[model samples]
Target chain A: ENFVPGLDGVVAFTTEIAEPDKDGGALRYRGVDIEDLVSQRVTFGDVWALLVDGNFGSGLPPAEPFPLPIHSGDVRVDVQAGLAMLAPIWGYAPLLDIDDATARQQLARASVMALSYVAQSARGIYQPAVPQRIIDECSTVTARFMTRWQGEPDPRHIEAIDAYWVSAAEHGMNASTFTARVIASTGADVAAALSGAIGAMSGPLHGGAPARVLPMLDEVERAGDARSVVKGILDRGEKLMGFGHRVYRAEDPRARVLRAAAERLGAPRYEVAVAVEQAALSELRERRPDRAIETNVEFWAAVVLDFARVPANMMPAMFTCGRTAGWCAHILEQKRLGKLVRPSAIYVGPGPRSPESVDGWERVLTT
Target chain B: FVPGLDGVVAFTTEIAEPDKDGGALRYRGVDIEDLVSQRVTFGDVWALLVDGNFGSGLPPAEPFPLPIHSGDVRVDVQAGLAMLAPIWGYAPLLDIDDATARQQLARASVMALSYVAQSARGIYQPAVPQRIIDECSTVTARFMTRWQGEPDPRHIEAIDAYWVSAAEHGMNASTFTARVIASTGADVAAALSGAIGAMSGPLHGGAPARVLPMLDEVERAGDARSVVKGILDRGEKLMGFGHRVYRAEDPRARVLRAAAERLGAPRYEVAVAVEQAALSELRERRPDRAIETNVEFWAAVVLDFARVPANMMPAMFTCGRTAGWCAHILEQKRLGKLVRPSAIYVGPGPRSPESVDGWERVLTT
Candidate 1:
């Protein structure tokens, strides 16, 4: 129970939500395999619904596809206005301001709002709501939004986005999800918890990498030779972006899904990405055979997103939209338990010291 | 090591703790009861928190005259706070859009205590210690004055005392939230804002304002016993009763109740009546549980006595806790550790059904 740096190997919470089952070598959601759910063709809504409600009844009404309001001429302003609608006042908004809905539904509302904002911000176009017909009958609301954001009705793009969202849905006590729990432990509402998670996800270590992966892919493409570039980066001791993951010893299953999605979409840079992934994996195996390092989700996420024509800058925000539901599910679970998530920090510094021992004690006295 | 991180000793802090015997609470080794009896102004407590001294003179019986709006840096910081206040829900001020922008916004807000005070029409005291006093004094005064456009000195003192009592507690959710944000190398503003987000939750600082509504409901029901019983029967939680810590009555509640009584706060009788009703009913219903009056119960009373609007209660708590949060952030930064805890995966294994299955399912299902 000594201080474990980053609290690694710590079972921080007992979650029925999605987590990586290392021994089983699969991501499971409430005892259901992610691949199994994916095999069921679960849309983002289905995945979110099953996670929150533990059943197929998503409680989310089909998306009505309302017309996007032109609140401001400036895209950024419009986006801000959209986000502000989530919580209009600066503080003291009632908990559950939207209504009495299941966690998944609120999450869905947040996702719609965030995506519309990002779409407006990036493409300078107003995106209408994705109708229930499209959400329930078509690929996914996420894909529908992405394709709308990309200004293309590519069915392949919808398939890729759907896969990406499901794959990215939940990871056990990941930074953003943990942030959500911490906020929820304070008894905050779903939206506030989601907001904190969104902020935490912005950390470069968590959700900031897909955009970084884009440049790495670009670099490999420009070199025209995957092996040399991979070898060169390794020789310099620089990391080959998206080549390895923290939790996955083998290939990240999400990466596998995204790789296939990219391939199916006939990504222009597919051959380059495959070549780079293969060469990098081979080199990494040679360099550190003892350590199992494989392609992470970001590597192929970059390719799929790039092929979908999603801008690099908006990648993290897009990831937030996908994971918002997962964050909400965890928040609701933590709130249900009603236990505060406060852990004592091991005092490593000079503490319990006398007031005289403090550095500014003399100045404090004089002043 | 355990779920909810109970008793994990995740890290050590000297900020404050329940006494080893679990009777009294102490801030930096000073007993809360002693501090309460001394009747120290909130600014003195803040001085203790920020500078680790009670006053300019060591263990001085009286508080030091802390200054306000003296330095240019303080003025600039105040300006930034003013600028950032309007954009609380937006990306640039909240710092959601960009990392650098978030850091800038946070630093600016932290520096702007003087501006916050000035906006409330508090006089700017020029002395360093005086400024500190006035910062707390003026803000509380401005709040009271804004309520009536002219504040009573007694009301200002009550508000100041209430803040001092509320200033710091051991790593509760909001403080812990701030520490977690700090562990991620976030700036003070990001941590502060994030802490506020956490504190705004109904379970934490938000509980203070909610007490009023509960009181209103109890009064409307006209039978406290049935109301409490109905709430318990319906499996709904009664607010302002139980606390995560404090086996007996919360020490802060005792101090706040006393403060409210001393101030002759109008709502004190109603709060006391509701507290007694809720307690008696809760004890009879759940004899095994050791639920008692917590800080929020009396925090509501004192704050209500100060005429602080119920809607503004959480925000007010956020401002008071801002000092504690900054202190924790500094402590975490000093420890130099990122708080990235790994979760033990309890779900399915790595890849059971395969990516192709998921892909195909996407089309078929």
Candidate 2:
């Protein structure tokens, strides 16, 4: 009588955006195989367009530069000095007093700005002094910002970064994307929806794990032999950080792409990761022969993203910006569907406890 | 193929249930009828959402001295408010950096919203209680005296009853949104904020406020029948009617109707006439649709009778439903499972864009 606890097997909604095919074992965006897109050195914008508009004849849309407004006062400065900085800016769109349609547009603009602001702070940088020529091209902005933030505009790993962002852009009904859609379904402004999505992504189970993989690799390196390290972890019944995915039975195709990137970088950690993956797979196979557990996108993502110079701590928030386009696209799509995403629940708690019978409130009962 | 995940059993809960079959809702297995008849306060209902038992419960009713006052919260309320303040029309209660802080803020803010709104508008804020009944009694009394400039005992009782009943509804979109965020193991504030965002949507929480505007339009149109006809003729929906779930009369609407009748406000006559016209016109125009007056319809009437402003209706709904969202979040956290559902791809299959020129035809027409 119990429905799936997590609605894991439930086909909750249909999307033309991106689908993680369990049976066919492919992840497709706008009907195009992600592996095919990854094989070519497509820009992040190109993949963004594919996931969103399905095509971009004029190339991807321009990335508008978002300038944080001037600080209002001293109290404002203290108030917005920390993580609370993001919240106030998130609430700013409605105060603009625009029409509903215009508010949504402003929200989109605000989302990009807020994300950029948060990402910059995570790296200890100031708001962009002026609108830079960097975002004149959408496909390259991610890499452009990375290089800019790193203080060197090298194109060496730009293609790899694009591939990474594109790969991370959309997944079928992921926690964050679903979160955005649910908020959007309520007709809330985009900032609220996007912020909510970011919150959802912050959880350890979702986008939070990407950056942790670096530390896991670090720990494995400290332990000497890859097999023994993985063996000890498995023997102790501890879960490995980035080995398996709930959706993918075989290897995640994104993992393959990232693996290629890591191999191309030829970093020392790449070899270490390769060894860890091999040993982990072998051990996992021996332990649970029926399970098709394999390396996922996050395993090699550490190597590639590290090579790209994005810090491990900043990866999840960085992924938030990468996935922003997909989130907005899903929001638009859900709004068009024009139905409330309400679901039923099976009641399983207490039946009927009346006021007189309940033991706690003798004071009121006597009165 | 999936349309809105309607009727989809997402999870198991011992919280509230919308019993369409019985035309009555249940909270924790107690018939809402029995609870209402028992004269429970909305605070009692709020307590039910938290503790599962509603009798004579007296949780703390003190206004949270938001410690962020001394930068103690690390994330100050104004900081969170200043960040997202303009959108919600007011700053949130406090900055919640962790789950415990978030739960504290969520508990305090429902009471705080009443104070904030009253104080901002130069109304006299009143002292409230731990047993939500007394708390709600305080809120109703303050709202009547401050907003309406009069505090009748009957009005207070009616509002107390209405607010109590409005406390929760099972798995509405707002609560679902909160649960979805909660399932990702987000903090209570994130889930609650997301729920508020969802509730701000017109389809879910915005309906109550729109009822007054609909009534206003009918009043301005001269004849209620032609106004209904004029709206239907223009192919526009008559708001505050036709709930998605309730096929018959909305039970909450029935409860509010009783409240409105007890208040015996003159506005009730106008509301009744308009309701009749809209129903008859809807039945004649579209026989297949089982459109009826929903909770929003009567909720609007009750609020109007109680002298609550029209624009604040949605936020009021947000406050009441906040309890429900928190309940669902707690439940989902206990369930300890992620609520990620898969999607079937319906777009085109594996193909690269045939150059940039071909993309124009595929895209913007």
Candidate 3:
């Protein structure tokens, strides 16, 4: 009788990782404004440091190179396909199970290395994992990603990528993060929780937008008219990909940050993307003036990531690379709470009948 | 905002539920006792739990797809398969029909479990023994063949009861984990990946493994009562004895206990003796709480007697629960919304960077 379908508006647990204030049109990771993290050029490493601790450390400890024993022979390995082997450590098993600061630091480095391994190897699938020496010096999460994705490692691209990573690292109680917490609550290894989280993010509902957003940008470019493309998409009753959000009442703050970076970086399809955003907003406002269907993180992330030479297909996996920091933090925090999330269900089916009351059950079991 | 979501029904279900007052577990209105007593295969119970309709014929003797071996079988079946399973376009949650849902459930549950059980015992290449594939009448029958060449009929009988009796329970931590992920629109494989991870935890699924050592110590001490008393005196949990639910003995424990006795399981006597000491002590100490024997206690005897190692016991239990995980996943995908819960932010209330001690000194200067 007390069941709430979908668990909507239910507080499953508490967290200190992030706070998404919908009414305030803001987000804070451990009480620091996201805008502060992005605009102050706070590296993702700094954000990682802030989220795990209450404040920053001497930046994020550097990523170490992980061993990739399984080679895809000649075929191009999908980044996820490549990283799935390393889910044990990157999944953070005994690593998160321990409370030593050093353990957390190693897992943090390992999490970043997971991104680097899949990034460079998949880039080889796409030519760039940074060599081990480079990884030791790269230190910051985005710097390592920049070095791997682009062999030259441009400062502008690295900073722009950092903005996106820091913005995306944590969002309060999203599906993937929730999945991680649910697994963590069971006293499962941290790696187990991380694997579960990575699996959760694989679903299109949670980690899909950037892949579609990039395609939308290309469609507008090919059609040669942002207004016309936007009109067709709205007429078809399809959402202009990445134009709305479930939480934000205004434009997604991450979108605002990434959009600026995309424009400043002169991303490949900046003009067309901006034009599409303008046209889509106009169309959305014209059609549903009461709703705040504004541009979201995925739209600008698609553009900025494209500027950073990341392909459309790998965006969600990339998001996982950054968000894993938050996932690990949540796991550690959930372990602290130590509550087994064993919820009951309302049995809507039958009476208090015995085995004798039910016929033919014997046939199924015995057959 | 229920912590642990306890007592606050997370959702309504047509699947299995435990009647704590009666100490009975039912799947889709049919009691598990009826299913186990009927002498069914694990395959049949899996079908009944998911489809609510049971057929007379046994599940086909389909050998597992051994060639599709994804790496790291050390991980749970769901985790291993989720690595290979696609994120999208398998089954659209709302659009899938009942017939297809059954097929999808089989792929996620039985088929993947065949692979998980195979790799667990270190049979890597050309998985099924040729002679057994055609003769094997059940997935568990074939699984036993891999564990030992031409398994004992009694082991088959005992495991069938073991699997069916333990098939489903209401909102177990692992099943809930699967449902939570499925509510995110993940495919069955991905949901189970998280589910199995939950099982790896000592609090939930590793009970069967610990049961052996507890009894092993009791036997070595040559005194079951003294050993159990000493362990309780140390203030440690008697792992397999108590359950989170069930005031009476866990119903599945009785089914497995009966199977172990019938199978001539060597440890059966030791377990009953240990339980006698455990129950008397626990009843006296707790008095108010129900710390009766659970499914894992007898489960240890049956699996151990069948020559399965203690380490693989948790993994095997997951194989049985895969059926429940699939039902929960498909059910949630059909009727549930994305499981977006709220977080009450309990961090330092909206502070800045500069206010922190030793903060910005190394802000990339």
Candidate 4:
């Protein structure tokens, strides 16, 4: 009788990775506040180390090499062609002598590299699965991504991307994480489960917003009237993207962090975003004062990413680099928990009918 | 609280409802036994589940293409193409077009299934054909034919009947995986690839090849009693004797044993002796337990008769189960809601670190 359609408020399982305090407007990753994580300048690699290995050592680990042999048809390679090849590569890795630990490392790291590979290819920089260079640099995931995507990047811009990754690193049990857990609950390894997780993330419901947030920012900038753009979208009966979240009643804490980072980077889009934010608040309040539709991470996520010269289209894969940690952690946790996630289905179709009797049934097996 | 969402109704499906007590399995409200007797093709049943009416018919027989076709990578890329193809194939604005839903569903089903079927077939068939495509009647035909030559009538009929049973089952891990992914309004391929991953698990996907060694062991000893006893008395669980759900007979086991008989290929005689010996032994020794064969036992035998190696057994099952995933994807699309569930935070309990400095130690330790 407690069949929830969205499974809203139904406990899927428990986790220590991260929890969103919808009431307090806060998120804690690995028992640390998003505010503290952003303020202390915890690099993306630092959060990655904490979530996957449960290690928060000051020393950063060298970027793990992409485990699989490079895909030949590998773009828009993040979810499109890139992630689809992961299942086969990781599955076949056993024959190549790669084990579970390496596979988990590859999933999160390779995601960043795969997106970086595509971004560099778009620049005609042309490096395919740069395992040696990654190890040679001995840098964190964020640093390597910055170098690979935009050669010779600014350190502060790199810090901006790092903060974004830290904020995006983990959130408790979203849909894509649900996909990973379900697939992982089957005892499939990290890449196989992660491939499915990546697929789930690309679905329009989960991952399409950050890209739209930028286009909205661009529209607001060009139209030069934040109210008109916000009003126009609400008038067209479209969801004004990046303004609300299902779980958060308060302003998204990550939005607060990302906005701070954008300001630190001096992204003028940060200023334009605030204009839109207030305009959006006024319109939403004037529209429905009863509802708590506040700015979400995607709103400020667009600003920080745009400041780094990252294109809007690449946001899904880029955001996924951080979430790869949570997906892996959840998959690992589900493995330890060891319950198959198959649920019941109430059949609503026709009544069961008898088959046309045939001699086939009577022909029993005889030795 | 329920572990693993058991007995939690994820959603209502018209596809297949398995009666765990009565041991009756129905597909889209039609008893599978009828579909077997009526010689209903898996194609017809596919039409039944998706269209909610029978005989909308199969997609055109065509060669589904993939970049890689050797080892595991071939099936791997086939799965990728299933997710990627929708982005390019029919196009993915993420809404079902009412005008062409049937066509879209059929081709998508074909892509999800036929690619893997051909992946195994391509493994043995030297190289890709001149056209780079293998033409067959339907996915069922692609499954039965190795492309060396046409499959015999009995081969098609028996396999067709088997697929009709295997085409759908109630809320299996892989099917649930597909539904959960589709519940997000994901492209059908995205849902299918998730299902394929779940179906690859040794636990969820039966490692029927493991059954072959036991069958071969029984054959070598030329006695079922001793082999069955040696495994059982040594406190080893029989590979396919017990199922988690059914306390009675496994209805699918009956269809598969019958299909093996119709094919009448190698090891059927040995397999029969083994099954009989296993049941007899279990009943006499452990009367309180209901020990019946499961689908995996003779599935090994059937695939063996079909000349499929142990490695490809999982692939064959994945191919058949894709039908179930497709049906559920269609249903989830019609329902159109996200399956995003709540996850309770059991750890830390809304607690935070005292200081940012070395706060990692509190979490890490």
Candidate 5:
């Protein structure tokens, strides 16, 4: 019942906000839990549609248009798409070493460069991408970004790209995204806002999560079972990468869905990865029988991707693509809320400086 | 020496590595603080101004003809400038209420569209503000963008003419010339970065250290003089509308002085509206102290010409002129020891996150 701009989190009666940990396993947007959507007919576009307006895809009537308010409605969802498109350009391209075909990377670099040039010439510009255009461009950007850097990406291994991207499209506002929304609340432009969010997402907590998945898979592969892998990891006090979740203390719902999807679409190389991880897990449980370490979505993703033969380093980029959509949505939401999120910090230094003897504190200025 | 990427307040080093702050602020190939405050002058410049063997400001002795990684480095100082350009154009123009003129706004809108579009395109896309043949084409593009919803060549004519009129002045203004000089740092591509950095911070603490927040307190407190008296009484920090380093007439006065002269000659009706409102607002508040708004803060009004949001004004100012900061950092690297400004810190509670978590303290009220 207490609302102080942004102290305790506030709930919206939207049809598409992420669900709380206590409410369910995995995450939900508005009212639709991701569990239902990821397994059902929902595409990445469908999730984006829900975030902008509490509705399904193939276009709903405009919620309210013609400059109602900056972030009030769905007018700026196209910006979300634009930000999402950067994932393939930036994230995927960097994963491969060749840097041979630089379409997405070029586009990402150009996007940053272009914004600076355009702001100076005394012009105000706004370009909104259509939904279909977003899907097509993102697909091409991700696909090309993947192959060009890796000495020609595998064509048969393409469907997993969309699946991974869709899985990442939205999660609750973790650290980086929360930073983006806070910046947006201060009325920073889309670029600054998104840039801040990117900064936060680049942190190991968010970006590094997917990076740990493959290694976790390798341990499980060597041990031969999840139980053994969990036991060994826990005994060594190694922070299990894709096991426990702060939000879903009980379990991670996303793991099983992605696990099945990987099996359906993964390549042969993915199988070797799974085997390595299975052996590790089995050995771990056999060594120590008392621990209960749950495998999360990241764990399954590692196995699935290993089965698909994707390199471990590229996982972070894939995470960026999916989460960029969520970041954009949150930033837009901040604009709608129209609140500058300035948090209070308690000053606990040697005591407050007194003005009467200001010169006395001058020496304090030195290290 | 506790050295290992510690005490990094501003990534002023010239490197491009990710930092503890969870954001990447690069100088050369180093961090901002290292580039600006720690490293030797030439080294900092070598990182930022010289990507490799190629120098930053001076044209390279040899063309950087090698393939992509040869000498190419990305500098993003212009990002803010690109975003702010269109807003600055619309800022002063928005308050006008005349219907015909408002409709004619299609003209100004077109000239301004180039900045954001070019920024999005990753090219600085400077309007040939002075040249003639290029002027016409730039105007037409603006025309098509603003009035694309409407079709009336006659309606478009006035806008076309205005852009042509506004087109290409010599590198006379601070911003225009600042960008030009900054661009010469190495590539034509980097000019906007230098210009934007310069525009954001010139001689002042670039980020509006305490002024805007002070105004928010004034609004919250409901008494301007009381707050000013409070600041004076408590010796608390003050934000905005003050001068430092210049007890004499502010140097940027020249640009405004010339503009006033032009306004006097043209007898433009709306010329003084923003200035007058700002002056009167300060006068009405009648705080015990006498403080005139600095040209930098007042630039917020000019930013309104392009319709920049009020919140973004201060940031826009900094972002637009970030090129200046980059240049200044590079210059500091060239001339002096690293900039090691000092400040007192009183917190000695705990060192790690867990210990800090155990200590219950707050800095803001």
Candidate 6:
């Protein structure tokens, strides 16, 4: 109750779309029915759409009800545009979804391929290039990506991007989006909000994870089996980058989705690879008996994308493309719901250091 | 240089007009010099043409002559048939100069005044309440504030954006433009670049400072003598804002100069207020404090425009204004130069916890 200080009368609205059962297995959206949707039709788009609209129309609700207001488009189109822009890269990088061998190998393979391709493409082009080229090319890439999702033939690039989007679709309000939302809630300008979010996302703890994984997966490969890698890592007690998730104590459900997608895409087969990772996962569980640290979504997504031939350096850009949707969604929401966010801060220094007190500080009178 | 890490090279060729010791600034075909002349302006046609084609001009280059550009004459000449937008109560808010009192108070007053004026004007039927006047009128007032000046009273609510644009000028390029040759560099983009280097503008420090209308507020409150008192009493700070040029600050010194001259400034004790600020700066800034806020720093400029709610977004469209500058800079930096900024990072203060003997500690782990 006393966790936060000096602020009161702040009200938060909850979207009680789901209720967990005793075993924590079942979850519902709007209490009607997520099971059918989740099992059949509820794509990630559906979940996100409902998050904003509060209803995923399967012609489910009242037919002659109120028309969908312009504001009803608060999320979908804008967020779709953002997702389409970035989805190609998200899965490989920071949110390295490499759980199964299939997922991990795909991620590794795709990362190397994609990054090498990006570097090669970027080379032999104009030097000291302005951002316009990238912006222009990004639009083209995005268009192609949209085309692919429209059932066009999947290019190697689009395939890489699809997994990126799947991974980037959501990541429990971690570093970047949390900063974005917090900034947005306070009513900072949209660009300022986005820029602040970008700043946080670029930090090592956030966007840098994909790059961190390259050397890591390499070390694992050098160590032979997952057993050696896992034992070596645990023996050294290394908190590997792409291993576990905080929320998923049971398995990461997304891992299954990504693993299946990888297989469907005909990623490199790895029966032995799966067994090794399982052994590592078992060993990890045995080592940390109190807490469950399973092969998370990142572990699998990374494998799938890598095996798909997405390369290393391109990982961050890949993630950026995917998360751009969330960023845009948050930006549009902030603009519509205008509020100047002035969060309170506890004084940490000696009182309030005035211009008179701080060195090189000068008191400029307010004209 | 470790040579290998520095992998790439880029180049370009384009020249922009630079505001040297004394010169004018322009976006495209419109000279900012005439912005404050009360009649001349970069009308909609000029703005559109520039926004479309010449918005992002060029890369840094060898010192070059200012090129004459062309625009739509039909659009420009037909301006005679058109009347500028009707001046509502919101007009005065944008008309501000550096002749007002404490900017913050002035800003609140301006926003409150403008919001009510624009809202009232928008609805038709006259007369507004005083409380509504007080609450909605001050943000731009705070924004346009220079360290010294008073709110202009005669035309209390007119949007004098002309006065606001009075201080625009370009200063960064010519310095490097000249220095490039002196340094024996072949062209402008080379031997003249930084990660975020200056453009041709003298008013390099844009936005927040550009919004302040310090000088006008000081004058409006009464005289310069009352400047500090009016600011201090109203809880305002006295800090002249604007650019910092080694050679003769921003040329808009003349615009504020003319306004101050017309006002017969330095009236009773107003001189004292100026002196006080000068003394404060002298006492505070050891030797290196080369400049203080200029005319653009404090004014009722933004406050004056508060009445024009339709235009407040544009009035405070500070960063948007910098879009051109950013575009130009982006182009300028493209001359085979990989911008690498060098700065010393002074980490958090070095104060470590003292000896363990001085206090007791608990270590549960």
Best by DockQ: 3
lDDT of 5 by residue, A1-367 (tens): 2322212233221212344343345455555555555555354544554544434432111111111111211111212223323333334222122222242223234332222221111111243322232223323333433332232446444446545555666666454455544444444334444443443343333422453555555565576565566566667878656544234554455655666566766555356545544554455455555654445567666655555455554344345545655655565554454444322211111222122232222212111
Displacement of residue B308 (Cα, Å) in model 3 is 1.6
Query: After superposition, which runs of candidate 1 have C-alpha atoms over 4 Å from their true positions?
Result: A30-42, A55-104, A124-139, A185-187, A207-211, A227-237, A244-246, A332-367, B1-3, B20-150, B181-191, B209-293, B333-365
Tell me the docking grade of candidate 3.
Answer: medium
lDDT per model vs. reference: 0.60, 0.61, 0.69, 0.66, 0.35, 0.32
Question: What is candidate 3's lDDT per residue for A99-217, written digit by digit as tens?
Answer: 65744664475566556655655455434355767655665667777666566677777876787788788887788888777777777656667777776676656633464776777
TM-score, per-candidate, Cα-based: 0.71, 0.77, 0.89, 0.88, 0.43, 0.39
- Write the number of the candidate with greater TM-score, choosing between 5 and 6: 5
Superior candidate under lDDT, 1 versus 4: 4
Instruction: State which candidate, 3 or 4, has the greater DockQ.
Output: 3
Cα-based lDDT at residue A211, candidate 5? 39
What lDDT, from 0 to 1, does candidate 5 have? 0.35
Judge candidate 4 against the unseen true structure and give its global Cα lDDT, from 0 to 1.
0.66
lDDT ranking, high to low: 3, 4, 2, 1, 5, 6
Best by TM-score: 3
Model 2 has a clash total of 12
Question: What is the TM-score (0 to 1) of candidate 6?
Answer: 0.39
Tens digit per residue, CA lDDT, model 4, B1-365: 87677667678777778877777888766777767766667776776667665646556445545545435733454344544543455443256663354566577666655566556556555634524334555556655553434566566665666667677877777887777777766566667766777676655754454688888788778888789989988888787776345647677777888888876766888888888888888888878866778777877777777666777767766666656777788777777787777777765544344443344443220
Error of 2 at B90 (Å): 22
Task: DockQ each candidate and list the results.
Answer: 0.24, 0.35, 0.54, 0.44, 0.02, 0.02
Report the error of model 1 at residue B335, Å. Answer: 4.7
What is the per-residue lDDT of model 4 for residues A226-336, given as tens digits with 9 covering 90 to 100? 999999999999988777644466667888888888887787788789999998888988888777677767777778877887775566666766677677678767766
Query: lDDT (0-100) at residue A21 of candidate 1?
Result: 60
